[PDB]
Each structure stands twice: as structure tokens, then as C-alpha cells.
Potassium inwardly-rectifying channel, subfamily J, member 6
Amino acid sequence: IQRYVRKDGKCNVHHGNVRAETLVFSTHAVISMRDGKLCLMFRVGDLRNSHIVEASIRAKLIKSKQTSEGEFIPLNQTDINVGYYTGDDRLFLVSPLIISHEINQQSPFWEISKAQLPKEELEIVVILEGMVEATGMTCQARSSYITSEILWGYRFTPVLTLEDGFYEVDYNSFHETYETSTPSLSAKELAELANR
Amino acid sequence: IQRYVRKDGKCNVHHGNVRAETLVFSTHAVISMRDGKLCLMFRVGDLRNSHIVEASIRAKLIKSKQTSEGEFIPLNQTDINVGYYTGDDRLFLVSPLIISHEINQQSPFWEISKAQLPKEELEIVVILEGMVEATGMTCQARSSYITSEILWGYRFTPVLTLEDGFYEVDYNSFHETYETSTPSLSAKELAELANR
Amino acid sequence: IQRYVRKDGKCNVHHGNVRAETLVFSTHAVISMRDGKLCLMFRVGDLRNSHIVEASIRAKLIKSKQTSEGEFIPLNQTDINVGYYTGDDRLFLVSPLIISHEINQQSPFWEISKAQLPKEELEIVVILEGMVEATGMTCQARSSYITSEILWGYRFTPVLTLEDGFYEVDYNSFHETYETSTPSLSAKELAELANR
Amino acid sequence: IQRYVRKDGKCNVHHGNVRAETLVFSTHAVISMRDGKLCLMFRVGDLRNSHIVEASIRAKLIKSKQTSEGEFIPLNQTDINVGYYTGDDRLFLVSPLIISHEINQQSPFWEISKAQLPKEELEIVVILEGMVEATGMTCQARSSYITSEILWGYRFTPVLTLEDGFYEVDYNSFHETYETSTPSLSAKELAELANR
Ligand SMILES: [Ba+2]
């Protein structure tokens, strides 16, 4: 077994790195099953020449809404769960990671099917926050996924390969995704159906 | 659909901004229903020429009290829930936001009606904390709402409009509020009544 | 009603302050009832000439212990709950505050009576952490309470008084405490007794 | 009773310290019972000549996996619970500490027995994060434990001794461990067995 991180803390990625260049999120996001739960996932990249300490990820849902009392909220924000409750939003970014938001009863996508999706008017803001080790300072990097940019029933291509006691990232594959069998029911719908 | 945040992370607000000037909270706060829950809301502004990273909001209730054992606490503090449990207190401040505190059993306003309000001796301290991107440093901004400054049964006027592929903020409307039909019972009272 | 914090964020404490000097905890800590719950409380002071942003408080229990399997832990640490779950450990330090730890089933003092106390071999480490506004940097301040320094059945004297539209702190009273009727049973004991 | 931390905040460790040198984790990690729960523990050292403020610890499990739907995740990460929920991951590092992760239903080691262990292909990444008081800046220190480096049924040797009103650390013992009677069943197995 070849290690990912060595005893002294130095990682075994990007052979001959030196741990501005900017961080990248995948251009699209995907939705598909993982151990029987429907998930939304987007890929967040790393920085080729330094770690990001106290790194964390969050997401906001931007969607205008009307409260049952007629109050209309343009571009309302609501937090999307991507690990906050278990500290899985506290990232160890040393290679591109697939962030996953399980679509459960408390997710805003709970009632959105595949057909329902391209009709909805919404945007997901993805915000990475950490301290650039080398730089000393607090960075923030943002990106955005609009409806048309969320691909139902796809999955992210892997980019990680072990080569000669070092792990290397084929950054070409970063944004690439492939298709997989995926039900077109809504999370909610899937849940009711399984519940009988 | 015109985006709020572009793929590269640059927002589409305040056409031709350059992302000291000071942040502003609304002068008053309002109380009114949102999807059948009574809420207290105050508006928190943004900074016209920079983001605030790791931005977060909290509120303290200042009200002198007497413990059942006679211990009198002058200006006692207790935390007001404004998203802490779900990370909705972690703000993405790129335009004035309405912060909302749902008045539930664990809120201090649970037993305060409309008539009861102007009688109570209390103050809400609102504290924004984040890192000014441009400046590098940790800022804090504070404000305060006393009883007379909490308007029962009102709502905040919207200030957000889409113009020419950019969203613009009519800062005149920032502090302005309007009236809406709102029961004058206390949260607690409303709850009991609905519970039968 | 005279405000504690003004609309522009400036507080109304310490008339003519300018918002190194060091922060002070009370020399002793006290234990006594608050709304029918037994509490341990110590007082944490403020800094006369600046705020402390992102201020937070925590406490550690240092007590050597033996695991049921004979493993002996010298000076074992375990966290004492002082608001962590509700964000009441996130302080708004603009005048000396009484920090309170409710002694419940999950507290380490759950089974410690008044008589039992002076026999136990333990220490409470109190750690304040925040960013000194003026200084720019992250401070930490520590103190410690050993058994003999925890006064059962006392309460903290108030130090806060309103004078001429400003609130002033009689720093003489800071460490002073007085006595109050307080049962000498353990929290656990009190609980069982009330439970019948 | 000789104190660990003095009233003024100065600790009573490392007689004549001055509160780069690098922090050290133990070379191995151990698994063994503590009050009837099976735990995984590794030791994290302190820094001989300065405190680490806002110090915190986290751990990641790196293990490649296949989702029930065939999606294969190379070097998947998942957070290991080491105090996050109760703030026991917020460390008071003034002498080497044994960090403990209780192996419960939500731990990834729930179904891993002693025999099962050396077969599994996994790695634990341990990440300390804090602010070096003297330095002003945010540090991160990392280490790693692979299967062969996790010793089933051992415990950490104590290194802490009281000498002349000061506590001293025999840094020789730091990495040393000894054996203890320890069941070779999996946590899960132990649980089922006790549940009847
Ligand atoms: Ba920080």
C-alpha cells in the first residue's frame, strides 16, 4: 500500500510540487445515486502549489420565493447542506474533491424531479474559504451553477491515478462527467415509493 | 435567466464596482409571518466596494432579569437564534439581506404579544463579523434595536432590481418598511390556538 | 430607557474610553441555583480600552482518572459546557460577564455535593479567545480555579450601574461575592429527589 | 494539590520554558477499551516553547470505495469523530495529549475486528490547526497512520510527571506504548453480544 500523506505531513501528490494561481470548481454539477440516496455533487479543485488550511466549503441556494403570506423574496438565500453537521465541510484539499449534498427532506431539491428541474428558476453559489499556507492570508473562491448547468443522472469522471509512489491528477478529466442509470423521480417521490 | 454570480466568482451587482466605508443595518426591525411562523427580521447591508469573507451574524438579547431565586441580573445577555444551527448565519453578503429569527418556543419573544411589546424593557444587539477581502483584516460592525424601534406587523420593502444584466440596489428603500396583516397574539398564543 | 449600545455601534460603557492592559477573570468561582438549576459560574472581565471580536469562552476540566479497565490518565481533560451548543459561548464582551455552566447529567459535577467538593482533586481551566480590535491580532487569556477556590452556595455581586446616560463598572466589586441559601445536595441528588 | 495552570494564566509545565521547532504526533496509533467503549487513539504533542491558540484537531479517513451503484471512489475521504460534537476537538495543548475516537455505530471502524484490520486498505490523516501565539500566524501540522501502523489492543504509556511544583514530559515515552487485555471482536460484534 502506497501512502497518500507521509509521516512527516508532506503529501504524495503532484510529483515535484513546491508546497497567483486560482482554484477551480467544475463547470457543471451532477445529480445521481450514492448508496441509495440521491445526491447533488460538484467538484472542487485544489491549488497546485500550496495547501489551504482551515479550508471549508458551503453552498447557498439563490431562488426568489413567495411566502404563504404573499411576501415575495427576490433571490432569497438558503444554506445547502454539504457536511456542516459532521465536519465533512471541513476539507483536506490536496487533490480535486467531489463535494456531495444528499438530497433529503431538508434539502431544497427534495421535490424536484428530472423533468421538474429544467423548469425551476434557481442558482447554486459555491464558496470555498481557507487560509493559503504560503500567503498567510484568508482566501475566498466562488462559483455558480444555474439550472441548465446541473446535469441530472450523471457522475464525475475520476481524475486520480497512482504512478511511481506519487499520485497524479489528470486535470483534463477535471470537468468531464459521464452518464449512469438514474431514476427520474424526485427524491420525495423515490422516498414515498420505497415506503411501501 | 440572468445570473447573480458568474462562473469565475465575480458577482453581478452594483454595475462598475471595484471588488473607509461603513456597513449599515436597518434603523428599525420588524415582526411578521413567514410561512405561518412569526418572525423578527432586521436588514443588514453590504459593502459597496468589497466582499466580506467568513461573514457571520449573531444577535444578543439584553434584558435585565430576576432568577426565581431572587438573583437580579442587570442587562443579562442571551443568544438570539438567527441561523446558527443550520449555517444560515454564515452570510454571503453581496446585497442587503433580511436576517430572520423565527420566534419559537426557544426564542425570548415566545410570550410577547403586540400589546405586550411596547411595555417590555429590552434591546437587541446585532453583530456582524467578517474579514474585509481588500483590507485583509477582521472587521466587526454593531447595531441596536430598542423596544420602540421594533415595528410589529410590518415587512421590509424590497430593494433589489435587475437592470441590463446587472442587479442594482435602491439604497433609499434600505430602511423603508410597509405594513401587512399580522395577528396581534403572541407566538405562544398563536401556537396554543392552532393546537386545537 | 437608556441604551447599552448606540445605533452606530458605539457602546455606552466606561464614560470617555477610547475604543498592554490584560483581561481578568474573577479569582474564585461560585455554585448556586438559577431558575431551579444548579450552576457553576465565574466572572470574566472586559478590556477597558478595546473590544474583542470573535470573542469566545471555553473551559476544560483537569482531573486525573482511571478507566474501568485500569488505564490511569494523569490530568485528563474534558470540555465543560458553557454555551457551545447555543452560541452563548460567543461573547459580546463590553462589560464583565458572569459565565454559567449548568450542572446537568452531562456535566462532570453532576455527582458532586457540597461536602463532596472539597475532597475532589480537580482544576478548571478557563480560556478566552478573541481578536483585539485595535491590535489586529488573536489573543488568548487563561485562568484557573482549584477546588478550594470554588465557593459552594455563593453568588456574584453585581458591578453594573447606570450613571448619566453611561454605564459604569465598579471594578472593586469584580471579584467580590456574597452568600445565598443553597441546597447542599448534589445536582444528581436534587434531581432524583424532585423526581417523586 | 499542585496546580497545572496558575491564576495569571502561565502554565506549570517544562520548567524554564519561554512561552522553528515542529510538532509531533505519535508514530503509531492504538485501539483499546475505555470505560467499556472501544477506542482508537493517537498521541498529539505540544510545542516546547509556545502555546497554540484556537487549537483544534480533526481526522480524515482515506479509503477507496464503491457505492452500491458501482461508482468507485479512489481515496474517498470521510470525517472521523474526535470531539467535534462536544468541543473536545478544541484542544488546550500544553502537554502531549491522547486524542480518542470512540468507535461507535457512526464510526468507520464499527465493523472492523482485530483480524479484519490488517486486511483493510486504509489511512488516517491527522490534522492539527492553530495559531502559534509567538508567531502570530495560522499553522497546520499533519500526520498519517496506515493499517500496519495501528496497533490493536495497546495503550499509550504516560509521559506526565510532577516534579518540584512543575510538571515534566519524558519525551522518550512519547511514542512508546504497552499491551493490555483487549477483546478481538469488532465494535459492532461487541455491541450485539452485550445486547443479550
Ligand atoms: Ba479565524
